[PDB]
Design a binder for this molecule. Structure first.
Ligand code: ANP
Length: 821
């Protein structure tokens, strides 16, 4: 059933006796010192001045766009303006306001900020609360504001597709162009025709907010103006000159291989622009030598385009602290790895270890609230340094920021449709992002923004980042569209504000079919309904889903985490060869790059029990990035409580013993890997080591692979996750599997005979010898599992592996028996 439907399932029932209660409470608030102090902060915001022009536009029209500068008050104020208007007109009980957020933490932290501005507690029957998935602090039924995530709304449309209890819906941060926000807009636009009463407010940062107006039929639009002080900008040349930066010698040595050998993408029109860059480079350097010292130019020539130089940021921070006037510094970094690294770099220095600095890492997976004291002001003499990702570009505003360090990089998903490769990587900011970052420094006074890219690069940046719909694989979206009965997949996507390419759509639908999430009429299978309940890429979904079904949870979640993000191995330059020997050491006899990660991870936990010296000694002698290991560990946790939500495990812990009974069985883990990586399958050529593919002919093994020199495989088949082309095609990480694993989790099953041999074909190209009875057997077992999955839709509960006679243990045990041939 559904546990997060309670604010939605209450009926909107206005009550004049509550209309009076809310208005009397409104004037007792006016006497409360906590309340008046918060009101003095609110009147300073530009939104306050426009308070009633905004509410008149909202009240006269059904769809409204509100643009404004960042920090003007959109997220925290507009809901209050609506609610307080209805209160003041004695119509308070009629207000049920829903405000969608892009991230859980936003929903929570905003609800808590708003509740303290109303001088109330959050939830507990007061005016404001939040609902995220699995966790809520709900306000009262009527006259209330609810902060939720777009994910919640999408679940809500399963039980009430008209959202009839809700009076006003506010779509926040829509300029971020998240997938979910983009489809929600399209759903909402069609809803308007059936809900005369419903009011919709779209809230966007100023840039291109007209586009949303035009998608909605040229709805009214209103801009909240703000003032930003002028900001001095600096490119890399300027920073290098100002601080006379010199990279370290003894630090930089034994540099960490990447590009092809750690598996990067290098798409089509990045290379076209990068051909422009290397052609304009000599002329740019010669020019620079006229305006900058020789040493500045010598350093810049040597700068690495791939990584953010965290030592330069550390230097630059130190210069600002010592040479510039008071003011908080804000640092923009691509992701969590760099944030914690920079943090550790700073506080490895005795200067910053003082109480005259407040150094705050800030990111979306951060615990609790933003109550971390990001917002609190520093007394004179103490300097606040905030190290963040792009969520401080628009979602969050720190008022006292005066210096902004823009690392120049942002993490983007990307998807190449011609060779069918989906990557995530650090990419250059756009001009639009760079302009938003610069503005965070002009909020209270004249500021400074230091961009870590050179003049040549600045001129070649893209003007805007592309919406995720145009660069992200579409499989999760497509499951949402059918679970919501929105109709044809391709047809619906074509109606989006920015419709995806048709090849992206066809590739995603094919993938869901090969995964058995859709049948060949493009309709949900029992398995697909469960995959849609998981907020992960479906292939990762199927794998972690079966890791719970087959009771091998802990190693599966590890592999799933590494496929989702990346493996923990690093190769220092020149140390390639002995690093390969340690990798194949961890491989033991598995013939599996995936079980290597598992062995490396399991070794790491037992090593961290034995103390730092033995743990650091481990990551060193076996070449693991302990930073990477930690995030994988944390993704394991997330995957677990994903499973907890869908009802497949009874606990939030991945090492829970009841879900781990088969975790030491190599055959079974390999079956589960196969569940998620099919149809990427290769047939090994018998006695260079090369393998046949359905896609690409004869291909080779990537040299990082524990199977690259291997000639004693014990089965004929491999599965791989990542394939990449340079001069030819190479498989990155592969795992030898039995034909019986393919036969169960694979495509359509067919039988051939003639005179000589009994043959089973899977998807017609995968052909092995075995008796025809086994084919009828797997046909039967597949249908029994389908019904196990169907009947766990309506009341999901984890399989109990301690019950003998279950009819779920019976079928899965039979399936386990079959894949153990
Ligand atoms: N948790 C908080 N604690 C203190 N001040 C806050 C908090 N959240 C926001 N503010 C302040 O509230 C003001 C407006 O913030 P906010 O309402 O998010 O503006 P906005 O950028 O227009 N809305 P949005 O960009 O959509 O999130 C700024 O001065 C912020 O510093």
């Amino acid at each position: 059933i559904d546990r997060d439907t309670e604010y939605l399932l209450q009926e909107n029932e206005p009550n004049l006796s509550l209309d009076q209660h809310l208005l009397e409470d409104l004037q007792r608030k006016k006497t409360d010192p906590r309340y008046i102090e918060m009101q003095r902060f609110r009147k300073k915001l530009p939104s306050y001045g426009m308070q009633k022009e905004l509410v008149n536009l909202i009240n006269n029209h059904q769809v409204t766009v509100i643009s404004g500068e960042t920090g003007c008050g959109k997220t925290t104020q507009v809901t209050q303006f609506i609610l307080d208007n209805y209160i003041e007109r004695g119509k308070g009980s009629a207000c049920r306001i829903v405000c969608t957020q892009p991230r859980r933490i936003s929903a929570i932290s905003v609800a808590e900020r708003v509740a303290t501005e109303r001088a109330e507690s959050c939830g507990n029957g007061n005016s404001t609360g939040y609902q995220i998935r699995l966790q809520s602090r709900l306000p009262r039924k009527q006259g209330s504001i609810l902060y939720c995530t777009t994910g919640i709304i999408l679940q809500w449309l399963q039980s009430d597709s008209r959202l009839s209890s809700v009076s006003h819906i506010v779509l926040d941060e829509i300029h971020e162009r998240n997938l979910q926000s983009d489809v929600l807009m399209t759903v909402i636009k069609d809803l308007l025709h059936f809900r005369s009463d419903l009011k919709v407010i779209l809230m966007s940062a100023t840039l291109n907010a007209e586009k949303f107006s035009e998608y909605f039929g040229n709805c009214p639009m209103i801009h909240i103006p703000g003032f930003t002080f002028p900001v001095v900008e600096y490119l890399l040349e300027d920073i290098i000159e100002k601080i006379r930066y010199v990279p370290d010698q003894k630090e930089h040595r034994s540099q960490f291989k990447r590009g092809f050998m750690q598996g990067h993408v290098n798409r089509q029109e990045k290379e076209e622009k990068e051909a422009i860059y290397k052609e304009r480079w000599p002329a740019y350097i010669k020019e620079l030598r006229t305006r900058y010292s020789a040493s500045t130019v010598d350093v810049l020539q040597m700068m690495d385009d791939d990584k953010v130089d965290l030592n330069l940021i550390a230097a630059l921070i130190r210069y600002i602290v010592l040479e510039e006037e008071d003011g908080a510094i804000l640092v923009f970094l691509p992701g969590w790895d760099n944030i914690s690294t920079l943090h550790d770099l700073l506080m490895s220095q005795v200067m910053f270890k003082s109480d005259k600095f407040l150094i705050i890492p800030l990111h979306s997976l951060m615990p609790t609230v933003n109550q971390t004291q990001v917002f609190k002001k520093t007394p004179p003499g103490v300097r606040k340094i905030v190290i963040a990702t792009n969520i401080a570009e628009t979602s969050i505003t720190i008022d006292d920021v005066v210096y902004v360090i823009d690392g120049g990089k942002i993490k983007e998903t990307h998807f190449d449709t011609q060779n069918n490769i989906s990557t995530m990587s650090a990419e250059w900011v756009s001009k639009a992002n760079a302009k938003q970052r610069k503005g965070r420094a002009g909020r209270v006074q004249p500021g400074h923004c230091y961009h870590l890219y050179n003049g040549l690069r600045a001129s070649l940046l893209d003007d805007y980042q592309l919406p995720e719909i145009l660069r992200t694989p579409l499989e999760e979206l497509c499951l949402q569209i059918k679970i919501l009965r929105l109709g044809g997949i391709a047809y619906f996507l074509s109606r989006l504000m920015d419709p995806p390419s048709n090849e992206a759509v066809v590739l995603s639908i094919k993938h869901l079919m090969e995964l058995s999430a859709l049948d060949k009429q493009e309709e949900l299978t029992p398995l697909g309904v469960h995959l849609a309940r998981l907020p992960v890429e479906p292939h990762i979904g199927k794998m972690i889903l079966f890791g719970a079904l087959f009771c091998c949870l802990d190693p599966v979640l590890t592999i799933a985490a590494s496929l989702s993000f990346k493996d923990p191995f690093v190769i220092p330059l020149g140390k390639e060869k002995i690093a390969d020997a340690r990798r194949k050491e961890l491989a033991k006899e598995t013939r599996s790059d995936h079980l290597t990660v598992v062995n490396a991870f399991e070794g790491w936990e037992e090593a961290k029990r034995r103390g730092f010296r033995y743990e650091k000694d481990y990551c060193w002698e076996y070449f693991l990035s302990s930073n990477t290991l930690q995030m994988l560990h944390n993704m394991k946790g997330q995957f677990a409580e994903h499973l907890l939500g869908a009802g497949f495990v009874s606990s939030r812990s991945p090492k829970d013993p009841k879900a781990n009974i088969n975790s030491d069985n190599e055959k079974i883990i390999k079956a589960v890997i196969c569940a998620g990586l099919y149809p990427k399958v290769a047939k090994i050529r018998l006695n260079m080591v090369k393998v046949h593919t359905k896609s690409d002919g004869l291909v080779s093994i990537h040299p990082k692979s524990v199977n690259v020199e291997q000639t004693d495989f014990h089965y004929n088949w491999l599965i791989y996750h990542l394939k990449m082309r340079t001069s030819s095609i190479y498989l990155y990480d592969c795992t030898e599997v039995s034909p019986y694993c393919l036969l169960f989790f694979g495509g359509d099953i067919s039988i051939q005979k003639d005179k000589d041999q009994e043959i089973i074909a899977v998807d017609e190209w995968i052909v092995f010898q075995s008796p025809e009875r086994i084919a009828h057997l797997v046909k039967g077992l597949r249908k029994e599992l389908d019904s196990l999955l169907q009947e766990k839709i309506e009341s999901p509960h984890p399989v109990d592996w301690d019950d003998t006679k279950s009819r779920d243990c019976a079928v899965l045990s039979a399936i386990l028996d079959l894949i153990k041939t």
